[PDB]
Amino acid sequence: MTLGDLWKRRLNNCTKEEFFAYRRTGILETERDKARELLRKGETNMGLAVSRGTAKLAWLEERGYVNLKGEVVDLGCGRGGWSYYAASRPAVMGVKAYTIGGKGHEAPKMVTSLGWNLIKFRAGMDVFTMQPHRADTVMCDIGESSPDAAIEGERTRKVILLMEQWKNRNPSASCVFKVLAPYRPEVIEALHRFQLQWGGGLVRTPFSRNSTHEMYYSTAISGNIVNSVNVQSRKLLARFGDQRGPIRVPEMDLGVGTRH
Numbered sequence: 001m002t003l004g005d006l007w008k009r010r011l012n013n014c015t016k017e018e019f020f021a022y023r024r025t026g027i028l029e030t031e032r033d034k035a036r037e038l039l040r041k042g043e044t045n046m047g048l049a050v051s052r053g054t055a056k057l058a059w060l061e062e063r064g065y066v067n068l069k070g071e072v073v074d075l076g077c078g079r080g081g082w083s084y085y086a087a088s089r090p091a092v093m094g095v096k097a098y099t100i101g102g103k104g105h106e107a108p109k110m111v112t113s114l115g116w117n118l119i120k121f122r123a124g125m126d127v128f129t130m131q132p133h134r135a136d137t138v139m140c141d142i143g144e145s146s147p148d149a150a151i152e153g154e155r156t157r158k159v160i161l162l163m164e165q166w167k168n169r170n171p172s173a174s175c176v177f178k179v180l181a182p183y184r185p186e187v188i189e190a191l192h193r194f195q196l197q198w199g200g201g202l203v204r205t206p207f208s209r210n211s212t213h214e215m216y217y218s219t220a221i222s223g224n225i226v227n228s229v230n231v232q233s234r235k236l237l238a239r240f241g242d243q244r245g246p247i248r249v250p251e252m253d254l255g256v257g258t259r260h
């Protein structure tokens with residue numbers, strides 16, 4: 001059993017009050033007061049982020065931890081916060097965004113955020129059985145949380161296997177993907193094998209809530225994986241009992257318009 005496995009059990013052992021107090025303590029949180037209503041008021045001319053995903057990818061890019069360029073695929077695009085972020089980048093030429101949709105799964109939010117015309121959205125698409133195609137940048141933000149850590153590890157393993165498939169098709173592609181449960185031994189094994197072939201490493205974004213162990217893997221960084229995981233597990237376990245709230249920051253606003 002790992003330190004992260006214990007973090008999960010301690011998380012699930014929280015009372016409701018301890019859970020609410022823990023989940024957002026000390027994390028960055030974008031201010032979505034305007035964004036949120038605009039989206040369900042059906043306003044489509046808006047460049048405010050369609051989800052909390054946009055600020056996470058932006059942070060990775062602005063830190064120099066991901067290379068977004070050329071033809072991008074967004075695997076599991078959901079509402080599309082990563083797709084819109086990618087489309088707004090000048091080095092990005094196009095975005096092919098795929099998501100399953102249906103019951104309990106977000107469909108793409110349709111807005112005129114800068115570069116929207118470079119995105120081809122395909123809902124109803126299962127990326128795990130999709131044939132990989134040409135891509136310069138492969139992104140995947142898939143990983144549904146479960147109170148069962150063994151289910152989280154299996155969900156995570158599936159993402160890593162998917163990224164191996166896309167790398168087999170595109171050995172030179174830049175990759176960035178969610179690693180929902182990096183503390184599971186079966187995940188560590190698959191990540192170490194990924195890293196030995198393709199390089200890369202793991203990083204924690206400051207917007208992730210403490211109720212998730214999610215870390216992001218990218219071929220543009222490096223670092224011992226077990227150390228990265230254990231450092232994060234210790235930091236998560238140290239926040240139990242912390243009273244500070246979240247730190248509110250402005251939401252990303254990419255502006256509106258086409259890119260040609």
Ligand SMILES: C[n+]1cn([C@@H]2O[C@H](COP(=O)(O)OP(=O)(O)OP(=O)(O)OC[C@H]3O[C@@H](n4cnc5c(N)ncnc54)[C@H](O)[C@@H]3O)[C@@H](O)[C@H]2O)c2nc(N)[nH]c(=O)c21
Pocket residue numbers: 011012013014015016019145146147148211212
């Ligand atoms: C709601 N919730 C979530 N977690 C833990 O946080 C992890 C992910 O964090 P999140 O679940 O809050 O994030 P998400 O984006 O999914 O939003 P939401 O708040 O709607 O969470 C719903 C999920 O939590 C699960 N859940 C609901 N109640 C509990 C609970 N009492 N204990 C554990 N899991 C719970 C539900 O089955 C569902 O899977 C969950 O996998 C679980 O270990 C909780 N732990 C306690 N101790 N009490 C909780 O109320 C609780």
Ligand SMILES: Nc1ncnc2c1ncn2[C@@H]1O[C@H](CSCC[C@H](N)C(=O)O)[C@@H](O)[C@H]1O
Pocket residue numbers: 050051052053054075076077078079080081082083098099100101104105106125126127128141142143
């Ligand atoms: N097998 C699958 N094929 C395609 N999409 C899937 C999938 N399994 C889960 N998904 C979708 O993957 C999405 C991940 S949500 C990621 C947030 C997104 N990057 C943003 O910035 O808004 C979810 O909407 C989920 O419905």
